[PDB]
Amino acid sequence: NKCDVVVVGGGISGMAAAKLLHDSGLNVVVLEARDRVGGRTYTLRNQKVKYVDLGGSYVGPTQNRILRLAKELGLETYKVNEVERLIHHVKGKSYPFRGPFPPVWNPITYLDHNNFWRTMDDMGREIPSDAPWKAPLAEEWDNMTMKELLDKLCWTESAKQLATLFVNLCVTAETHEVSALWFLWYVKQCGGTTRIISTTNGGQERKFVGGSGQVSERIMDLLGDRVKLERPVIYIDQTRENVLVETLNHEMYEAKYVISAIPPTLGMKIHFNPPLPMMRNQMITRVPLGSVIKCIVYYKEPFWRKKDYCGTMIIDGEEAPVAYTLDDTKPEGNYAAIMGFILAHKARKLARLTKEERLKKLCELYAKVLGSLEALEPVHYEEKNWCEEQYSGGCYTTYFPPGILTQYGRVLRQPVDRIYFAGTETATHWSGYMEGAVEAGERAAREILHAMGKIPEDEIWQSEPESVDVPAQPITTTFLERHLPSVPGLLRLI
C-alpha cells in the first residue's frame, strides 16, 4: 500500500534504483509484471546446460557500474574464450584471422574498410553522449538511415556488407530502419567501434559465473517482500497529494515518487492521469526495440579448439541464419557450446520454423564454417525469441528510426511531475547494455534523493572508479590507419 517510491519494473535498472533508495533509508516497492525479475536478462538452469544466459550476458572493460554492483552481490566473472583464431566466412569459405577486425587483402577494399571504421569514429567525436541532438549536423544525420550513410561511404560491396552485419549485430535492426545519428551516437557512447566489437578488451570480454540473472535475483533477495511479482502496472494517477499506482491484479500503491524502469515504448501499457505531456505521449509510439533470437548449441567437447578456432565466427550473407557466434563453453571447459544470434529480418523469417528445424540449420552452418562434422552431432539446444515478449518488446534495446532522436530525444529522461525515468535507454554510457541499466537506475534514484532535499544537484550524476578485476586497456590506432586515404580520396590524387 504506502511507501516513499514505487519502481515500475524489476530489471537491472529498477532493481539498481530500488537498492540505492533502500540503502539510503527510504521504503521502496518494486512492481514487476512477470513471474520473475531480470527483464532482458534471464538465466535458465537445468542439468544439461547447468546455467545459460538467454538474454543479456556480456560485460567488459569500461562497464564499471555493472562490475561493481555484481561484485558487491558476490558475483564473479570469467573471460569469453578468444585464445585461438577467429573466423570470417565470406563467399562460402572460412578465413581464419587474429585481432578484433577481419583482415582485407585487396588494396582498394583495404582503403574502403579502413575509411568506413575510421569515419564512424570521426562522426562520433562530434556527438555528445548526454545530448546527441546537439551534434553540429544533428538534423542531417538524423534524417538519413544507416542504409543511406553506407551507400554514400562504402565504395566496395565487401565493406558495405561487413558494415551492414555490424549494424545488424549491434542494434538488432536493419540499416534502413535506423537513424544514422542514433546509430553513430550508440557506437560512440559505447567508447567507439573497437570497444563495441571486441571480445578481448571490449564489450564481449566477460560473462558472469552462474549467469547475469543473479544480479536481479540477488537484489530481490536483499529487498525481501518489497518486490511484487506479477504486478503489471496499468494506471498512474498524479492529480492528488501522493502518486497512485494501480496494478492489473487490482492492487493500489501510493507513494511520493515513481521511477519508470521499463523500455520507453512499454510506457504505452500504462494509462496516465493527467495525460502525459504531448512530446512524451508521441515519443513512446516512436521507439521500437529490435528483433533477435538467441541460440545456443551444446556439444560434447569444444572441438573447434583442436583446429585452433576460438569459436567466434563472422558469417557474411543472406543465407546464413546466424551472422555472429561466440564460444559459450564454461570456464572449466565443459558444457561445450556455441552461441549465435539470429538477427533482425532473419529473426522474423526463421521464427516460423520449429525449434528442431532451427537446430538443423545452425548445425549445418557451423559444420560448414568450422569445417567439422562434429558440428552435426549436438547434445542439447536452447533458444529464446525476444520478439514474442509482451513486457520487453524485443532485444537488445530500443532503436530510433529516422527523424525521431532530434524531435523527441530530449524527452527520454525528462521527469513528468513526480515520475522519473530509468531503464538502459536513458543512459549516457553503454546505453542499451546492463551497464546502462545500472547507470540510469542509480541516476533516477539520485534525482529523487535530490527532489527530497537529501543530496545536492551535483551528486545526481556520479562518476565510477575503474574495476580492479576488469581494467581497460587504451584503444590505439596505427599511423597508416589514421592517414591512408579513402577510395574517393585516392581518386582525387588521380
Ligand X SMILES: *[C]C1=C([C])[C]=C2C(=[C]1)N([C][C]([O])[C]([O])[C]([O])[C]OP([O])(=O)OP([O])(=O)O[C][C]1O[C](N3[C]=NC4=C3N=[C]N=C4[N])[C]([O])[C]1[O])C1=NC(=O)[N]C(=O)C1=N2[C]/[C]=[C]/N([C])[C]C1=[C][C]=[C]O1
Q: How far is the CB of 148 from its own copies (least distance, A)?
A: 7
Residue 65 touches which member of ligand X, its own copies, none, C-beta under 5-8 Å by kind: none
Q: Which of these, 324, 338, 317, 368, lies nearest to 93 by C-alpha position?
A: 368
Q: How far is the CB of 405 from its own copies (least distance, A)?
A: 12
3 state SS of 441: helix
Residue 288 touches which member of its own copies, ligand X, none, C-beta under 5-8 Å by kind: its own copies
DSSP symbol at 319: S
What is the H or E stretch that residue 121 is in? helix 107-124
Q: Name the site residues for its own copies (rule: CB under 8 A).
A: 142-145, 147-148, 174, 176-177, 232, 234-235, 248, 250, 265-266, 268-272, 275-279, 281-282, 285-289, 291, 345, 348, 351, 385, 387-390, 393-394, 401-404, 407
Grid coordinates given for 391: 513486457
Residue 52 touches which member of ligand X, its own copies, none, C-beta under 5-8 Å by kind: none
3 state SS of 422: coil
Residue 260 touches which member of its own copies, ligand X, none, C-beta under 5-8 Å by kind: none
Q: Where are the alpha helices (DSSP H) in 351-433?
A: 355-370, 404-408
Q: How far is the CB of 53 from ligand X (least distance, A)?
A: 8
Q: Name the site residues for ligand X (rule: CB under 6 A).
A: 8-14, 31-34, 39-41, 55-59, 169-170, 196-197, 203-204, 232-233, 261-263, 266, 269-270, 292, 294, 324, 386, 391-392, 395-397, 423-424, 432-435, 437
45 vs 306, beta carbon nearer ligand X: 45
Residue 407 touches which member of its own copies, ligand X, none, C-beta under 5-8 Å by kind: its own copies
Q: What is the Cα–Cα distance from 390 to 9, expressed in whole angstroms?
A: 13
155 vs 386, beta carbon nearer ligand X: 386
Residue type, 129: S
Q: How far is the CB of 214 from its own copies (least distance, A)?
A: 26
172 vs 199, beta carbon nearer its own copies: 172
111 vs 444, beta carbon nearer ligand X: 444
Contact 343, 172 (CB under 8 A): yes
Q: What is the Cα–Cα distance from 239 to 349, expressed in whole angstroms?
A: 46
Give the bridge partners for 11, in sequence order.
38
Q: How far is the CB of 282 from its own copies (least distance, A)?
A: 5
31 vs 67, beta carbon nearer its own copies: 31
Q: What is the Cα–Cα distance from 445 to 434, expressed in whole angstroms?
A: 17
| Per-residue 3-state assignment (H helix, E strand, C coil) for 223-252 | HHHHEECCCCEEEEECCCCCEEEEECCCCE
3 state SS of 87: strand
Residue type, 191: G
174 vs 464, beta carbon nearer its own copies: 174
Q: How far is the CB of 438 from ligand X (least distance, A)?
A: 9
Torsion-angle region of residue 190: left (phi > 0), alpha (psi -120 to 50) or beta?
alpha
Q: What is the Cα–Cα distance from 273 to 296, expressed in whole angstroms?
A: 44
Residue 80 touches which member of its own copies, ligand X, none, C-beta under 5-8 Å by kind: none
286 vs 305, beta carbon nearer its own copies: 286
Q: How far is the CB of 140 from ligand X (least distance, A)?
A: 26
Contact 289, 40 (CB under 8 A): no
Q: How far is the CB of 216 from its own copies (least distance, A)?
A: 21
